[PDB]
Amino acid sequence: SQTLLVHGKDAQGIIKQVLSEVYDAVTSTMGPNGQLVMIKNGVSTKTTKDGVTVARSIRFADEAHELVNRVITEPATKTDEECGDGTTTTIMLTHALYHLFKDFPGFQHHRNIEDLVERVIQRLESMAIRVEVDDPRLYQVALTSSNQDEKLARLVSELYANNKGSYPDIELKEGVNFEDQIEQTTGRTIRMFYANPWFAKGHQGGVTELTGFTAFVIDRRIDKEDTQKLIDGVNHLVKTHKQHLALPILLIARSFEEAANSTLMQLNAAHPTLVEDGRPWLIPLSTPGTSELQDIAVMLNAPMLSDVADLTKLDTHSINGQHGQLELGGNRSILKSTTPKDEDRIEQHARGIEELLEGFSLSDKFSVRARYNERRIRTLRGKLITISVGGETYSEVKERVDRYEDVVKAIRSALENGILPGGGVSLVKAVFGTIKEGLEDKDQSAEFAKRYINSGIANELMRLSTIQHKLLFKDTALYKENGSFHFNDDWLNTPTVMNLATGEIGTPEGLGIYDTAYASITALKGGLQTAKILATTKTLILGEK
Amino acid sequence: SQTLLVHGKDAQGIIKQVLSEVYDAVTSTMGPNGQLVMIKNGVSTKTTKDGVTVARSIRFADEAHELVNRVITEPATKTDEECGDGTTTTIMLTHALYHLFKDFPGFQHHRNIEDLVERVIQRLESMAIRVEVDDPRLYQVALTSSNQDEKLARLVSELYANNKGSYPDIELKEGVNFEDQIEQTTGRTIRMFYANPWFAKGHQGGVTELTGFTAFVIDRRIDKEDTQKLIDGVNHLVKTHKQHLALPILLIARSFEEAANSTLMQLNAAHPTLVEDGRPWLIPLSTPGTSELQDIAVMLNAPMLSDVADLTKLDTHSINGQHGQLELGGNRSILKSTTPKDEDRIEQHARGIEELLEGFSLSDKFSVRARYNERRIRTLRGKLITISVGGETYSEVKERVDRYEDVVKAIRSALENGILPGGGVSLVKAVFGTIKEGLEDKDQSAEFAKRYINSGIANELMRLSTIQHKLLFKDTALYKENGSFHFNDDWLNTPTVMNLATGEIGTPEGLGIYDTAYASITALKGGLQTAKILATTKTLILGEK
Amino acid sequence: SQTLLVHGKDAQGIIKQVLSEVYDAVTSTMGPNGQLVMIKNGVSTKTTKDGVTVARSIRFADEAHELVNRVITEPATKTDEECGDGTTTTIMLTHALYHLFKDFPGFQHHRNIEDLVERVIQRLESMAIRVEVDDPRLYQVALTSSNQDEKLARLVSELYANNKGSYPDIELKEGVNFEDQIEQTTGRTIRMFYANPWFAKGHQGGVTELTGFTAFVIDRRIDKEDTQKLIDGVNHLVKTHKQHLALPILLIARSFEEAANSTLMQLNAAHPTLVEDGRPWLIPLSTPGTSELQDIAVMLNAPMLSDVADLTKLDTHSINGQHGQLELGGNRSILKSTTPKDEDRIEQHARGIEELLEGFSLSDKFSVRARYNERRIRTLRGKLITISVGGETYSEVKERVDRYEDVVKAIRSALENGILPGGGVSLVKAVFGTIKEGLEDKDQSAEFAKRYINSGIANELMRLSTIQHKLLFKDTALYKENGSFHFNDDWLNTPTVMNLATGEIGTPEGLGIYDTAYASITALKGGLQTAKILATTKTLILGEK
Ligand SMILES: Nc1ncnc2c1ncn2[C@@H]1O[C@H](COP(=O)(O)OP(=O)(O)OP(=O)(O)O)[C@@H](O)[C@H]1O
Numbered sequence A, B, C: 001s002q003t004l005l006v007h008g009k010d011a012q013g014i015i016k017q018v019l020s021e022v023y024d025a026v027t028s029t030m031g032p033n034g035q036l037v038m039i040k041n042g043v044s045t046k047t048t049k050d051g052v053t054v055a056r057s058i059r060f061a062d063e064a065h066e067l068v069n070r071v072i073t074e075p076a077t078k079t080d081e082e083c084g085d086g087t088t089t090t091i092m093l094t095h096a097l098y099h100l101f102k103d104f105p106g107f108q109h110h111r112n113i114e115d116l117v118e119r120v121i122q123r124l125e126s127m128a129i130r131v132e133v134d135d136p137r138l139y140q141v142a143l144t145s146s147n148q149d150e151k152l153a154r155l156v157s158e159l160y161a162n163n164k165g166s167y168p169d170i171e172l173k174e175g176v177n178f179e180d181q182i183e184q185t186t187g188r189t190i191r192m193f194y195a196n197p198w199f200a201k202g203h204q205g206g207v208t209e210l211t212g213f214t215a216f217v218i219d220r221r222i223d224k225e226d227t228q229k230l231i232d233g234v235n236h237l238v239k240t241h242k243q244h245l246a247l248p249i250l251l252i253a254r255s256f257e258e259a260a261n262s263t264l265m266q267l268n269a270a271h272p273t274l275v276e277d278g279r280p281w282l283i284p285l286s287t288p289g290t291s292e293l294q295d296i297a298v299m300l301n302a303p304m305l306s307d308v309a310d311l312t313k314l315d316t317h318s319i320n321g322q323h324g325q326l327e328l329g330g331n332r333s334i335l336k337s338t339t340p341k342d343e344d345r346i347e348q349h350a351r352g353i354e355e356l357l358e359g360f361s362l363s364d365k366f367s368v369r370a371r372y373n374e375r376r377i378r379t380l381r382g383k384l385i386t387i388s389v390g391g392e393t394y395s396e397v398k399e400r401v402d403r404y405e406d407v408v409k410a411i412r413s414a415l416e417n418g419i420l421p422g423g424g425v426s427l428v429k430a431v432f433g434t435i436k437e438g439l440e441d442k443d444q445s446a447e448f449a450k451r452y453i454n455s456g457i458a459n460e461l462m463r464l465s466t467i468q469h470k471l472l473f474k475d476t477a478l479y480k481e482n483g484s485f486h487f488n489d490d491w492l493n494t495p496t497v498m499n500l501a502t503g504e505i506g507t508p509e510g511l512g513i514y515d516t517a518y519a520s521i522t523a524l525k526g527g528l529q530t531a532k533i534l535a536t537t538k539t540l541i542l543g544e545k
């Protein structure tokens, strides 16, 4: 608390200071050859090489330094929460691209660097190799994302490939045995759960299994304002349309406040003739992106309803009670028994979501809009599996669960969006390609030269694509010969790397070293934004008002 | 809190400091001739030569230093908690091997050091002398691991040798007298106990002795979910199959949450006709690795059950009420009376476990998987003995209790895995062997030389094998003659050492100086991992997030 | 808290400092001519020459210094708690022998020093002059241990001699008069007392005098586990065997936890027919060494029972209700009336303990094992005496009570083990003897010379025996003539010292200056151990974990 207002020379110095310290720490963990980082936590020591774990728990003493550290760390942390295996890359490029922005000042050069790197992104996005569950590269991806786990990669790839048709939903548990053990189901994880613990069997939040139901999906949040219309709708359904009905009635919605739940408790007590063995016949269900309720509506054959007053005006043409088999729960509900007649409705709705993705743009295919829509497909078509992960201690069991979770996140986003050849190669191919593409094109080579090549940006950006390949294999067998390394035509056609597990030299495709497309793309995208932000900041404020 | 991120040169410096300080402390306590360490605790002074106690209670002021200290200590602390007498050797070799790793940098050399030490481990695993309880070397191992306790070694060794057939399970109590006192039982310690104090005789966690029971082993944990099925199962067992039944009914499980206990309380009161002299006829038993329950099932002739619903579907074929003698208890349960009919089932199951160990690999025979399967054997075949340890004060009693427990843990893991000749000899013979074996073999000498001998790692490793033998006998009779010492072929054939108790000079085999195999192996195994980690760490984080 | 790990030079430096500081403070107070020490406590001044009270209350600011202080002080403090008058001699030799240990480093010398001093202890052990209560040297010991109290020494040595047969158990109360007043009894002090204050007459911790009782001695501690067996055994004892029973029933044991006490309260409530004048008929009694309970059993004709269940299986052969006279109390119980039939049993059990001591080894006679068995004998055979000590003020009364207690403790351990001539003479006679013995012995002179004489240890140890005699009399009339003092053959045959009370010169035997054997031996014993510990320590750890 000497000075709270840092401007100009002082500001950029601290940004550079922090970036170059965060760079040094996280990049040292890269690949299977990476060096280790010890981390304190009270009275223990988690000693690690997983870049995410490093980046997240790096802290700084000065508030000014930690201010900037949050800006460098929060992007790369936010890659792995959605993607799976791709944080150290993001930081590496953040550093690299910042360096570039400073080499070429003046804010016409800054707009040029963006446009160039934005076209490098497009070339990666087009380089995305699409892959089926049948393919043996999925193993090769898992093998890479697991830091070479022969026993794990095999399982998850075998698990996806044995379900050649339906995309498996995986969850994890801390197991008891040394060996791993799997629990396959024909079950679909659904996002609805109990509003109040009173509505379960036994009246304290238990797991109520049903063999018949009649669902209704409401759009609005329900509070003290809707208590009149529920009593209007519920007594309308039970009095008039009792003939075509299978109990219990499920009132699925966004939210049920405590005023609404206490009203529905009285409505179950109002008609005790329908209470079979304790089970309440009326359940309100909640969900914490409006189209996810339309999935829940389609899975249970329930009508989509905007207002709570719509429950009165209903008919046998809109009302249809299912005779399947559901399991209501406190965290989430699960559907098991689905008739072939129902799965025809669900597959047709799934194709309909997929036909939207067929017609998206290439850059839109990697958007959050796209990734949210693909989350809906897995909820609809997707069997449930639970793996109880083992190990020799409690600590290895918990350690191994994370590495399962990284492989599941990677395999899912691999076949979802694409695959690229690893070893820092696809970045070099993309940059060296994008330069040559605009240059080779006689239509625009007049100006493309004047902006990027003539200025020197092109040659700088090409040097920076090397960064990843250098950091992996500098100080190895591959780099000892010929001083540094020649990235000539001959290399670009058949790009040699080293498998750091074995030692042998070959192509990434040949050795079996593959990155997830979504990672090495979203690393670059994030690298540019965060480099720009860092490079274009000239004022730090620490004042707590 | 000047800097929370320590990279590179600084990082290794602190690691070197904290290792070499911890080395200088703990290694000073080695052997019977070892020097002492005074330890503060509030308002008292523990003065000790026990390297475990030193290593465990070494602390550092700087958080960064303690960060590394924990990584050096926790492996050595981790040996004694499963082994018995072998902590100082672990730290010694952590130091030595760290020193090696740094002398040969570059991450091809590192992989070579590992593989060379890894092959030395295999030579120590093959050097393991397999020993029976009859053997007078068992005394010599106890004597060694007791720092020359003529009285103690003699007792425990005699105690193992007098039961030539069944492996003793020993426990220790704070005895009152000057003399020790022994309480032999024909009992088998079993890992089950009361879920609630109410289910004992007198209804407050007392010791219930039985002379007849009918057991059942459930695999799942039991909570509010399982209350219904218990009432279905228990009434089904008492109403239908009451004819072939010896009370009480035992319900052995993983865990019983308080809901399940209160249901089984009511079930005892429900059928008061069967309550003989207060004793509840239904007892739920808890155990804090599913195969240990299978052992419990096999000892009691109880059927193994996956679910709680399985209690309904049962018959005279699966139900069997034993007329033995069991003593239920709060901490544990004890089976004393076993009919010759029953022990044939148990021994055949015990053989089956040994037949899995027969066929395990050599390095797998020193795995946690292996040692867990040997724990099962002692639980099945094994008599219970309790020793009330005596001494001149309260403090010498409590002191002598640990020296008992160190000797029991050693003798057990000696005959379990193996024995080696001590005095730091076995380490030298192993290394000087492993170098000569690969070098003498004309098949692979061409490359073995190029990696290990020609580089200099082979000569380096040989010198570090001598560390233990030097630390013990440098500044003694043995090292006075010939300046230092000549580790020539002559010494390798018959290695001379000094017994630090008596003072005479001879072979470890002659003088009676033997390390356990599981100690001096797991010291090297843990020495390598921890030397790698230290040598390959290049970042320290102290940030409380 | 600058550093929490002091090694090597610095560790020994602080030890030397602390030892030499404790040496200067405590040895100042030695003898009658010793110089005073003023001690602070809050808001008052204790000014003293009592070496125990000095050593105990010496404190150090630095944690590391106090760490070492505890190790030098706790051994000297632990002499008086069992001996009486012999703490300053212990610290002196702790210093002197530390000095020796460091002059001769290298751990073959260390073992030679130990064995030499061990043999000096054996010469002190044989020089012990055995003494009967009739002997006038008992006055001369008391005089020495009272710092020349003409009146006090006279009382105590008369009080032992007057009871020429049974050994007196003495206890002290703060008296009211100027004079002292004695209260003789034919009673035996017993270590048992109330578990809870309910069981006394009037139900609130009063003194209960009984004139008949039926005792039972249980070995185990009693807790919530045992409450049922108490209800079985007590009702068994009252229902079946009421004919041969005198009330009340005493359940003597190791400990009674609050659960068991509440159960026995109900048991007194259960049979109100047997409650005579408020007195509860069932009392539990606790004692804070199983053979001390066997004494209690033998004194009260009660059976020795290993388990609580053993109360059921009993008979008129095992049950014997005494009609003596017993006074139950809150601190301790007292037995007054013993029929000559019963004392015939108690004397026979006393002889059996004496027959064990008769046949102990010489060095075994000075062990803790030996002394604890002699403690038992006094409990059995011995009359109770209570002296109320008076004086001019309250502070003189309390001051005089401690000097009383010191003289009783010395006289007891004087006639128990032996007596030696004081003035620091016995030590010099012992050391000069032990050197001459082995050296003059033809059989071992060869190697005796090479170990002690030829190295220089013998002459160093000869000088250090003088420390006591030099401290007492340097700067007196005795040391003025002939520079220092010639410890020659002439002196050894008749050793001259000075009575520091009178000022006359003569032999210790002649002037009537006598140490107790156990003290001067226990100073040298512990003085070696503590000198060795200090000398061999090379690591200090201040870390609270
Ligand atoms: N056997 C191998 N040989 C060569 N390169 C490899 C090998 N395994 C992985 N890689 C490369 O290492 C890089 C990945 O390193 P790492 O997994 O440490 O970074 P990250 O994925 O960003 O971090 P995190 O996994 O913590 O999110 C990729 O470029 C990949 O091609």
Ligand SMILES: Nc1ncnc2c1ncn2[C@@H]1O[C@H](COP(=O)(O)OP(=O)(O)OP(=O)(O)O)[C@@H](O)[C@H]1O
Pocket (backbone or CB within 6 Å): B029, B030, B031, B032, B034, B050, B051, B052, B080, B084, B085, B086, B087, B088, B089, B090, B144, B421, B422, B423, B424, B468, B472, B498, B499, B500, B501, B513, B514, B515
């Ligand atoms: N009488 C002896 N003479 C020579 N060496 C001995 C003797 N007794 C034990 N040793 C050696 O000393 C070493 C054991 O050291 P020490 O017992 O101090 O530490 P540790 O067993 O590694 O761990 P812990 O502190 O748990 O006992 C072994 O190498 C053993 O061979």
Ligand SMILES: Nc1ncnc2c1ncn2[C@@H]1O[C@H](COP(=O)(O)OP(=O)(O)OP(=O)(O)O)[C@@H](O)[C@H]1O
Pocket (backbone or CB within 6 Å): C029, C030, C031, C032, C034, C050, C051, C052, C080, C084, C085, C086, C087, C088, C089, C090, C144, C147, C422, C423, C424, C468, C472, C497, C498, C499, C500, C501, C513, C514, C515
């Ligand atoms: N009148 C005396 N003349 C000569 N020496 C004496 C006299 N009285 C006592 N001493 C000597 O003083 C020494 C006893 O020391 P002192 O009683 O001061 O302390 P301590 O017995 O070692 O321990 P404590 O402080 O518990 O009494 C003995 O060596 C004894 O011979």
Ligand SMILES: [Mg+2]
Pocket (backbone or CB within 6 Å): A050, A085, A145, A146, A147, A406
């Ligand atoms: Mg990972």
Ligand SMILES: [Mg+2]
Pocket (backbone or CB within 6 Å): B050, B085, B145, B406
């Ligand atoms: Mg030990």
Ligand SMILES: [Mg+2]
Pocket (backbone or CB within 6 Å): C050, C051, C052, C084, C085, C086, C406
């Ligand atoms: Mg005194």
